[PDB]
Amino acid sequence: ENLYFQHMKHGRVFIIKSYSEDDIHRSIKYNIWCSTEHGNKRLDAAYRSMNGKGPVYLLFSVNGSGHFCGVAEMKSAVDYNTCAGVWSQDKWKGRFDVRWIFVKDVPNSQLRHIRLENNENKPVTNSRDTQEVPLEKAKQVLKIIASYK
Ligand SMILES: Cn1c(=O)cc(C2CC2)[nH]c1=O
Ligand SMILES: [Cl-]
Protein backbone atom coordinates (compact mmCIF):
# COMPACT_ATOMS: atom_id res chain seq x y z
CA GLU A 1 0.00 0.00 0.00
CA ASN A 2 0.83 3.70 -0.33
CA LEU A 3 -0.77 5.85 2.39
CA TYR A 4 1.52 8.86 1.91
CA PHE A 5 -0.89 11.34 0.33
CA GLN A 6 -3.79 10.08 2.47
CA HIS A 7 -2.02 11.57 5.51
CA MET A 8 -1.46 15.27 4.71
CA LYS A 9 -3.90 17.61 6.46
CA HIS A 10 -2.76 21.05 5.25
CA GLY A 11 -2.13 22.05 1.69
CA ARG A 12 -3.98 23.63 -1.18
CA VAL A 13 -3.97 22.47 -4.79
CA PHE A 14 -4.82 24.35 -7.99
CA ILE A 15 -5.21 23.45 -11.63
CA ILE A 16 -2.98 25.46 -14.00
CA LYS A 17 -4.12 25.51 -17.64
CA SER A 18 -1.56 26.81 -20.15
CA TYR A 19 -2.27 27.52 -23.82
CA SER A 20 1.47 27.33 -24.58
CA GLU A 21 3.81 24.37 -24.61
CA ASP A 22 6.72 26.83 -24.78
CA ASP A 23 5.64 28.38 -21.50
CA ILE A 24 5.56 24.96 -19.80
CA HIS A 25 9.12 24.34 -21.05
CA ARG A 26 10.23 27.76 -19.78
CA SER A 27 8.57 27.14 -16.40
CA ILE A 28 10.43 23.85 -15.96
CA LYS A 29 13.70 25.46 -17.05
CA TYR A 30 13.60 28.50 -14.79
CA ASN A 31 11.21 27.40 -12.00
CA ILE A 32 8.88 30.38 -12.47
CA TRP A 33 5.23 30.90 -13.49
CA CYS A 34 2.68 33.67 -14.07
CA SER A 35 -1.10 33.54 -14.31
CA THR A 36 -3.71 36.13 -15.23
CA GLU A 37 -4.22 39.04 -12.86
CA HIS A 38 -7.21 37.29 -11.26
CA GLY A 39 -5.37 33.95 -11.19
CA ASN A 40 -2.26 35.55 -9.66
CA LYS A 41 -4.39 37.09 -6.92
CA ARG A 42 -5.98 33.70 -6.12
CA LEU A 43 -2.65 31.88 -5.94
CA ASP A 44 -0.99 34.71 -3.98
CA ALA A 45 -3.76 34.71 -1.35
CA ALA A 46 -3.54 30.94 -0.99
CA TYR A 47 0.26 31.06 -0.72
CA ARG A 48 0.33 33.91 1.78
CA SER A 49 -2.39 32.48 4.05
CA MET A 50 -0.64 29.10 4.00
CA ASN A 51 2.21 30.84 5.89
CA GLY A 52 4.54 27.89 5.28
CA LYS A 53 2.35 25.36 7.17
CA GLY A 54 1.88 23.25 4.03
CA PRO A 55 2.41 23.20 0.27
CA VAL A 56 0.52 24.90 -2.55
CA TYR A 57 0.53 22.36 -5.39
CA LEU A 58 0.02 23.30 -9.05
CA LEU A 59 -1.33 20.60 -11.40
CA PHE A 60 -0.30 21.64 -14.93
CA SER A 61 -2.16 20.83 -18.13
CA VAL A 62 -1.93 22.30 -21.63
CA ASN A 63 -5.36 23.38 -22.95
CA GLY A 64 -6.54 20.82 -25.50
CA SER A 65 -3.66 18.37 -24.97
CA GLY A 66 -5.76 15.62 -23.32
CA HIS A 67 -3.25 15.08 -20.49
CA PHE A 68 -1.69 16.68 -17.46
CA CYS A 69 2.02 17.36 -17.89
CA GLY A 70 3.23 17.56 -14.30
CA VAL A 71 3.21 18.97 -10.79
CA ALA A 72 4.90 21.97 -9.22
CA GLU A 73 4.90 23.58 -5.81
CA MET A 74 4.49 27.33 -5.38
CA LYS A 75 7.68 28.70 -3.85
CA SER A 76 7.15 32.46 -3.44
CA ALA A 77 4.51 35.12 -3.30
CA VAL A 78 3.69 36.95 -6.53
CA ASP A 79 6.01 39.75 -7.63
CA TYR A 80 3.75 41.94 -9.75
CA ASN A 81 6.40 44.27 -11.24
CA THR A 82 8.81 42.25 -13.39
CA CYS A 83 10.19 42.18 -16.93
CA ALA A 84 7.41 42.04 -19.53
CA GLY A 85 7.32 39.77 -22.58
CA VAL A 86 9.36 36.84 -21.24
CA TRP A 87 6.67 34.27 -22.17
CA SER A 88 5.40 33.16 -25.60
CA GLN A 89 2.68 35.84 -25.52
CA ASP A 90 2.95 39.31 -23.99
CA LYS A 91 -0.20 39.01 -21.87
CA TRP A 92 1.32 38.58 -18.39
CA LYS A 93 2.23 40.89 -15.50
CA GLY A 94 4.45 39.52 -12.76
CA ARG A 95 6.20 36.34 -11.73
CA PHE A 96 6.30 33.85 -8.89
CA ASP A 97 8.72 31.04 -8.13
CA VAL A 98 7.76 27.39 -8.39
CA ARG A 99 9.62 24.12 -7.97
CA TRP A 100 8.62 21.41 -10.43
CA ILE A 101 8.13 18.09 -8.61
CA PHE A 102 6.90 15.81 -11.36
CA VAL A 103 7.23 16.13 -15.15
CA LYS A 104 5.18 13.34 -16.71
CA ASP A 105 2.24 13.12 -19.13
CA VAL A 106 -0.78 11.62 -17.37
CA PRO A 107 -3.72 11.06 -19.75
CA ASN A 108 -7.04 12.62 -18.80
CA SER A 109 -8.53 9.12 -18.95
CA GLN A 110 -6.63 8.30 -15.74
CA LEU A 111 -8.16 11.33 -13.99
CA ARG A 112 -11.59 12.05 -15.50
CA HIS A 113 -13.42 10.01 -12.87
CA ILE A 114 -12.36 12.39 -10.06
CA ARG A 115 -15.00 15.11 -9.86
CA LEU A 116 -14.89 18.47 -8.09
CA GLU A 117 -17.78 19.12 -5.71
CA ASN A 118 -16.80 22.83 -5.74
CA ASN A 119 -17.07 23.02 -9.56
CA GLU A 120 -20.54 21.56 -10.17
CA ASN A 121 -19.20 17.98 -9.88
CA LYS A 122 -17.39 18.42 -13.19
CA PRO A 123 -14.43 16.11 -13.88
CA VAL A 124 -11.16 17.57 -12.61
CA THR A 125 -10.04 17.22 -16.25
CA ASN A 126 -12.64 19.81 -17.31
CA SER A 127 -11.24 22.56 -15.08
CA ARG A 128 -10.22 26.12 -16.05
CA ASP A 129 -7.05 27.98 -15.01
CA THR A 130 -6.56 28.27 -11.19
CA GLN A 131 -9.57 26.10 -10.39
CA GLU A 132 -8.95 25.03 -6.80
CA VAL A 133 -9.12 21.29 -5.99
CA PRO A 134 -10.59 20.15 -2.65
CA LEU A 135 -7.85 18.56 -0.60
CA GLU A 136 -9.46 15.09 -0.47
CA LYS A 137 -9.81 15.02 -4.28
CA ALA A 138 -6.30 16.47 -4.65
CA LYS A 139 -4.87 13.57 -2.64
CA GLN A 140 -6.58 11.20 -5.08
CA VAL A 141 -5.20 13.05 -8.13
CA LEU A 142 -1.68 13.22 -6.69
CA LYS A 143 -1.70 9.48 -6.07
CA ILE A 144 -2.81 8.68 -9.63
CA ILE A 145 -0.18 11.00 -11.10
CA ALA A 146 2.54 9.49 -8.91
CA SER A 147 1.48 5.92 -9.79
CA TYR A 148 1.09 6.31 -13.56
CA LYS A 149 3.71 4.61 -15.76
C1 LIG B 1 -2.99 30.45 -19.62
N2 LIG B 1 -1.58 30.83 -19.47
C3 LIG B 1 -0.68 30.64 -20.59
O4 LIG B 1 -1.12 30.17 -21.60
C5 LIG B 1 0.76 31.00 -20.46
C6 LIG B 1 1.21 31.59 -19.17
C7 LIG B 1 2.64 32.03 -18.92
C8 LIG B 1 3.06 33.28 -18.15
C9 LIG B 1 3.42 31.89 -17.61
N10 LIG B 1 0.31 31.78 -18.05
C11 LIG B 1 -1.12 31.40 -18.17
O12 LIG B 1 -1.87 31.57 -17.26
CL1 LIG C 1 -10.67 20.88 1.12
**The pairing of beta strand 12-18 with beta strand 132-133:** antiparallel
Q: Which phi-psi region, left, alpha or beta, contains residue 124 (left: φ > 0; alpha: ψ -120 to 50)? A: alpha
One-letter amino acid for residue 114 of the chain: I
CA 58 to ligand 1 center in whole angstroms? 13
Q: What domain range is 46 assigned to?
A: 1-149
Resolution at which this structure was determined, Å: 1.8
> Environment class of residue 28 by beta-carbon count within 10 Å: exposed (0-12), middle (13-18) or buried (19+)?
middle
CA 2 to ligand 1 center in whole angstroms? 33
DSSP category for residue 144: H
CB-CB contact of 117 with 131 (8 Å) = no
Of all protein residues, the one whose alpha carbon is nearest to atom 10 of ligand 1 is: 35
**The pairing of beta strand 12-18 with beta strand 67-74:** unpaired
